[PDB]
Design a protein around this nucleic acid. Sequence first.
DNA 1: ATTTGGGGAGGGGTCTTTAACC
DNA 2: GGTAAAAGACCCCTCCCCAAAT
Length: 111
Amino acid sequence: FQKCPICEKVIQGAGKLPRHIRTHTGEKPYECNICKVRFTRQDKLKVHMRKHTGEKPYLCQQCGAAFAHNYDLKNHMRVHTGLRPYQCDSCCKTFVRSDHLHRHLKKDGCN
DNA sequence: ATTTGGGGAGGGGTCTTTAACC
DNA sequence: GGTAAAAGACCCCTCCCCAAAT
Ligand SMILES: [Zn+2]
Ligand SMILES: [Zn+2]
Ligand SMILES: [Zn+2]
Ligand SMILES: [Zn+2]
């Protein structure tokens, strides 16, 4: 789509080029008025504000448990399914978060 | 000692909603 | 109201770091 004017990286996001351009300045223009923590983007600030408000918009359809984050809901759903979602293609290990599998592939030879 | 599980920050994509002009 | 954008809301991922578990 459109290339970044600075680093010439292709930004496929529709209307997301200014958002990427703001990444090069390193500033955090969004701030939580309560705990004074600064954020780069507004959506992260709202998800953080869920921490102060106590809002838990993610609902489990089987037991009604509520969570503030989508990944919390998934990791909880594995209590009903018992399924570890990420599996290594080479060493038979399984993991509960994607970055755990990435870390395993980065560290262990595995093959 | 080493591996797992999770908190909390970042970035990039898509779908919808909206702010700016006209 | 129409148009062409950016913002919002939400999805996914990785990273550092540190308890916790093994
Ligand atoms: Zn750039
Ligand atoms: Zn806060
Ligand atoms: Zn449940
Ligand atoms: Zn492996």
